[PDB]
Amino acid sequence: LEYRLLPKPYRFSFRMRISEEIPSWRVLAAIPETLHVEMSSEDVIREGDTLRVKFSLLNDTPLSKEKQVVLFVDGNEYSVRRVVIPPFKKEELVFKVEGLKKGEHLIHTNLNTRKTIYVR
- Which residues lie near another protein (CB under 8 A)? 43-44, 104, 116, 118-120
Which residues fall within 8 angstroms of residue 47, CB to CB, at 6 or more apart? 100, 101, 102, 119, 120
CA distance 32 to 41: 29
Nearer to another protein, 11 or 90 (CB): 90
Nearest-approach distance from CB 104 to another protein, in angstroms? 7
CB of 55 to another protein, least distance (A): 17
What span, in angstroms and rounded, lies between the C-alpha atoms of 101 and 19? 65
Q: How far is the CB of 39 from another protein (least distance, A)?
A: 12
Q: Is the dihedral of CA 90, 91, 96, 101 positive or negative?
A: negative
Task: Between 63 and 119, name the residue whose CB sits nearer to another protein.
Answer: 119
Q: Cβ closer to another protein: 11 or 114?
A: 114
